[PDB]
Design a protein around this ligand. Structure first.
Ligand SMILES: Cc1cn([C@H]2C[C@H](OP(=O)(O)O)[C@@H](COP(=O)(O)O)O2)c(=O)[nH]c1=O
Ligand SMILES: [Ca+2]
Length: 129
């Protein structure tokens, strides 16, 4: 897999955002994770976490997996990095997202994220509290 450039257009929520990629506005859905909706418990916290992680970053990058690059709703499916740190993993590590939606062929970073989830759970953080 490889990282490609992007810029932030707008925050949406814990696991979706509007980015500019190859010069076009797209909504991205983070691969392999599920944040609560804003109206659910820890939804606001997830949305804030994701929002801040991209606002604070100097360099946003997207990394597509081996499979489908857009979902049925037109959302780009990616791993997203903020100054080299994966947002998808950071959310899981903090108990603000569960590992989820692990479809065959776009699952390269599954076991990295599952390791993060296990540490979140042990620490009883957020969703695991
Ligand atoms: C993360 C992800 C979601 N989706 C689809 C499955 C779910 O369909 P349904 O809407 O039919 O439930 C939906 C979940 O996304 P959200 O968690 O953003 O709602 O997005 C994919 O198709 N591929 C993916 O990699
Ligand atoms: Ca969600």
């Amino acid at each position: 897999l490889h990282k490609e450039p992007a810029t932030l257009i707008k925050a949406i929520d814990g696991d979706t955002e509007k980015l500019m990629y190859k010069g076009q506005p797209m909504t991205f859905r983070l691969l392999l994770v599920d944040t609560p909706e804003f109206n659910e418990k820890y939804g606001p916290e997830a949305s804030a976490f994701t929002k801040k992680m991209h606002e604070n970053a100097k360099k946003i990058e997207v990394e597509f997996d081996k499979g489908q690059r857009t979902d049925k709703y037109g959302r780009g499916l990616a791993y997203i990095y903020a100054d080299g740190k994966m947002v998808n993993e950071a959310l899981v590590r903090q108990g603000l997202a569960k590992v989820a939606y692990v479809y065959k062929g776009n699952n390269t970073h599954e076991q990295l994220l599952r390791k993060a989830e296990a540490q979140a759970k042990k620490e009883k953080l957020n969703i695991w509290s």
